[PDB]
Amino acid sequence: FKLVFLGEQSVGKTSLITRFMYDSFDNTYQATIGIDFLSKTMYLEDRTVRLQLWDTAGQERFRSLIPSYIRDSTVAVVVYDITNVNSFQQTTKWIDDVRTERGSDVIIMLVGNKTDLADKRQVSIEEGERKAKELNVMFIETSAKAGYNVKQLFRRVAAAL
Numbered sequence: 001f002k003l004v005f006l007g008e009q010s011v012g013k014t015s016l017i018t019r020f021m022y023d024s025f026d027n028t029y030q031a032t033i034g035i036d037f038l039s040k041t042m043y044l045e046d047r048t049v050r051l052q053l054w055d056t057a058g059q060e061r062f063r064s065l066i067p068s069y070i071r072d073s074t075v076a077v078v079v080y081d082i083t084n085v086n087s088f089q090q091t092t093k094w095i096d097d098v099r100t101e102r103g104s105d106v107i108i109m110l111v112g113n114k115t116d117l118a119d120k121r122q123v124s125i126e127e128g129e130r131k132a133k134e135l136n137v138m139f140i141e142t143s144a145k146a147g148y149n150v151k152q153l154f155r156r157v158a159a160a161l
């Protein structure tokens with residue numbers, strides 16, 4: 001259960017981790033610098049699991065040694081912001097990066113985060129599911145802020161292993 005979180009800056013990667021691991025959320029953006037690590041045991045879908053999580057920096061300058069982390073991980077979590085079409089469009093790139101490194105020997109979850117921002121939605125659930133089916137990855141929509149589907153994201157990934 002070695003998980004790498006990928007996707008564009010400000011989509012909610014860190015926020016999803018903090019929500020799941022610590023059940024908190026904060027509004028003010030602290031960008032991740034390089035690749036942070038968190039390891040903890042959780043009771044997750046009826047078994048104990050040791051979660052080893054790599055939280056990558058979305059900012060372009062930090063995207064050089066990510067290959068090692070992708071090779072090191074059994075699960076890739078690729079997140080976008082449902083309010084931000086570019087961030088969605090860039091998920092093809094991220095999934096490709098995983099595939100280039102592991103092909104079919106990896107669990108991939110595509111995540112449409114920030115659903116609580118309902119009015120500002122620029123990507124439909126439909127389009128998200130479409131992309132997930134086309135690229136053969138799992139799909140879920142979450143809200144780190146409101147606490148929607150975050151436990152489910154980790155559940156579905158843990159039951160995928």
Ligand SMILES: Nc1nc2c(ncn2[C@@H]2O[C@H](COP(=O)(O)OP(=O)(O)OP(=O)(O)O)[C@@H](O)[C@H]2O)c(=O)[nH]1
Nearest residue numbers: 009010011012013014015027032058114143144145
């Ligand atoms: N409304 C809303 N805001 C969110 C949600 N998730 C994250 N945010 C906000 O969006 C901003 C970015 O969140 P981060 O968790 O720091 O995003 P990130 O993907 O880790 O960004 P980098 O580390 O720079 O790559 C912050 O201001 C968060 O408070 C969400 O589910 N809903």
Ligand SMILES: [Mg+2]
Nearest residue numbers: 013014031032
């Ligand atoms: Mg971050």
